[PDB]
């Protein structure tokens, strides 16, 4: 079992034999523009650059794709992956744009998704964007939808990639429901100009972890899109003041996180 | 189809030829004798009386539980209702409590329940209360899971009972997924002291009728619980307002709505 942060929400994943590539966005330093509608639009992305060359996440049994925003999949990763790499979607929606960008070997995966060997891949809910967000019509098309994974297996431990999603009640459901010894939360808190935070932040980090004092967190999504303005010191600064550093990990670009079972 | 309003969340349904009644809440007037030892104990709910009698209510097919909130289900219609009577509930946990309390005719809805009928009823995720709310653990537990209710069958208008939820995605795609010609509302306006609204209000009758603007709102939930914070004629004020009078419907109690797809 061994979860690497490459860049963003970009991780590589060891689990139960197989190997996943989730989230792959792999444009240059700077290669496209800032978001426009949020927070320090003048920074180009991505902010950093890749810690491996791009032929190292390509030996990959499957690609896991959450949501087609641009910092989860790009035009390098459509030019860079090969046509008939299996690609996992979340939905009829995301597969229909990604078959017309040239792919066709895509599995649409479902709420459970069973494996002969004894893996199991759960697709939950979350939701990219506030309450008051989602009251209108257009942003809500644009923020969507956007799983987060969950992975178990009996040889390995319970595994949880929350996705792009803000504190909502599917979240809580699904901390309750798995018990997941690990949790992987995009804590960027990217924030959109008039309806605020679109993820997650510090203070999530927290409410998880009374929520459930067992696990132990993976910050993800931070310091490279331009509107994400949490940054690891502060996030660091964050776990010493509640008495809560040995349970997050904030892992550099690069960084592989092993985790034993038994 | 038929809708009735009864009282607060409590009405009865007449659709593709069965009757259902959603949320039974069976107190008289000002009833409510729970009592622990409260200096100031409100003896308020229910704010009015029933409509009609409780012999009209029970002339039903099966009742239909969104959640175990009192006002949707209090100990008077615990009692009131009798135990061989055919129960839809929300989720397990439900099930057990009200099996616990006397019932043995018991069903716990799934996502989807297809019937060979042709009646469809799909089970929906709502969330009582703001996205601050459930950060607590307390009051999540408190205000809990309670799900809404679409009703899908030909010879039928599509009806969805929104049930105890304020506006998240959930009820968004709902919207887009199902298409109900008839949205009926929760707009209490009950409104938590620290965390904000834990049910619908004025705004939410808008922004759906934005989203879906063929669809009709059938206001409900409101003037029988004194938590609830909206007066009909506040939202009647408020739509009137906005250009929206004539598509939203404000029932008193005991008035009867019909929907027909044809005549
Ligand atoms: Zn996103
Ligand atoms: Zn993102
Ligand atoms: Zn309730
Ligand atoms: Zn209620």
Redesign the interface.
């Known amino acids: 079992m061994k979860l690497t942060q490459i860049r963003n929400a970009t991780l590589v994943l060891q689990y139960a034999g197989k190997k996943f590539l989730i989230d792959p966005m792999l444009a240059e330093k700077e290669a496209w523009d800032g978001f426009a509608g949020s927070a320090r639009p003048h920074l180009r992305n991505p902010m950093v650059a890749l810690p491996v060359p791009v032929e190292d996440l390509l030996a990959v049994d499957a690609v896991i794709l959450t949501h087609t925003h641009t910092d989860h999949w790009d035009e390098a990763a459509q030019q860079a992956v090969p046509k008939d790499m299996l690609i996992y979607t979340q939905d009829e929606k995301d597969a229909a744009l990604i078959r017309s960008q040239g792919f066709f070997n895509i599995r649409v995966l479902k709420d459970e998704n069973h494996f002969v060997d004894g893996l199991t891949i759960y697709k939950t ?1 979350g ?1 990219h ?3 008051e967000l ?2 209108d ?1 257009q942003l ?1 098309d644009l923020l969507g939808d956007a799983c987060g994974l969950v992975f178990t297996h009996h040889d390995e431990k319970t595994i949880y990639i929350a996705g792009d999603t ?5 979240y ?1 459901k699904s901390l309750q429901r798995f018990k997941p010894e690990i949790v992987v939360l995009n804590t960027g808190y990217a924030v959109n100009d008039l309806y605020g935070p679109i993820i997650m932040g510090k203070e999530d980090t927290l ?1 998880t972890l ?2 459930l004092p067992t696990a132990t967190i993976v910050a993800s999504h931070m310091e490279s899109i331009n509107h994400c303005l949490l940054t690891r010191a502060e996030l660091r600064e964050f776990s010493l003041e509640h008495g809560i550093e040995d349970k997050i990990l904030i892992p550099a670009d690069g960084e592989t996180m092993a985790f034993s079972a038994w």
């Open positions: 809910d939701q964007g506030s309450n989602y009251a019509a809500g803000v504190w909502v009640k599917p809580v409410r009374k929520m």
